[PDB]
């Protein structure tokens, strides 16, 4: 594989390790991966990081009751661009009524970009993905990894 392909694989491994850790501990998380539609307007609302990705940093960001935990992390390729970012809230009626603001923000950004957003529920530990206006819930670890590899 090329260096670009290896870097992508390392980033997917970092993300999946972090998401799996947070799901097990019921740490709420909201992680948007920018694709071809630029997300600068939303990146600029958060705290700039421009940091190399690691599972450790992703986990540390979302620890409850910390400066960076509220709002979205936005990733650009192999970097964490910013944390605590604003995302628009979807009004879609196909968001389960029990779900809170993290899921509505994820669907919201997915309606105006081609990004892929991962959500960990602090209530259940369930993992979901928002893409193209649709929310897919209760993902297995294998399903999440496959979705990321396909992205």
Ligand X SMILES: CCS(=O)(=O)CCN(C)C(=O)N(C)C
Q: Which residues bind Mg ion (CB under 5 A)?
A: 138
Tokens 């992508």 locate to 8
- Please name the residues in contact with 125: beta carbons below 8 A apart, sequence gap of 6 or more: 23, 24, 25, 26
The least CB distance from residue 84 to ligand X, in Å, is: 9
For residue 48, state whether it binds ligand X (rule: CB under 6 A): no
Q: Which is nearer to ligand X, 67 or 133 (CB)?
A: 67
138 binds, among Mg ion, ligand X, its own copies, none (CB under 5 to 8 A by kind): Mg ion
What element of type H or E holds 3? helix 3-25
For residue 17, state whether it binds ligand X (rule: CB under 6 A): yes
Q: How far apart are CA 24 and CA 125, in angstroms?
A: 6
User: Can you tell me which of 44, 56, 91, 134 binds ligand X, judged by CB under 6 A?
Assistant: 56
For residue 67, state whether it binds ligand X (rule: CB under 6 A): yes
């Amino acid at each position: 594989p090329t260096p670009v392909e290896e870097a992508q694989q390392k980033t997917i491994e970092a993300i999946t390790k972090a998401i799996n850790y947070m799901a097990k501990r019921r740490i709420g998380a909201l992680l948007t991966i920018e694709r071809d539609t630029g997300m600068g307007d939303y990146i600029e609302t958060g705290i700039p990081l421009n940091a190399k990705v690691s599972s450790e940093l992703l986990i540390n960001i979302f620890i409850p009751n910390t400066p960076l935990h509220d709002g979205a992390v936005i990733m650009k390729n192999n970097e964490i661009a910013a944390a605590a970012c604003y995302l628009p809230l979807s009004e879609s009626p196909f968001i389960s009524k029990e779900l809170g603001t993290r899921h509505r923000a994820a669907v919201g950004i997915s309606e105006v970009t081609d990004s892929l957003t991962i959500i960990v529920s602090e209530e259940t530990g369930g993992v979901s993905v928002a893409k193209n206006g649709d929310l897919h819930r209760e993902l297995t670890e294998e399903a999440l990894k496959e979705m990321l590899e396909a992205e």
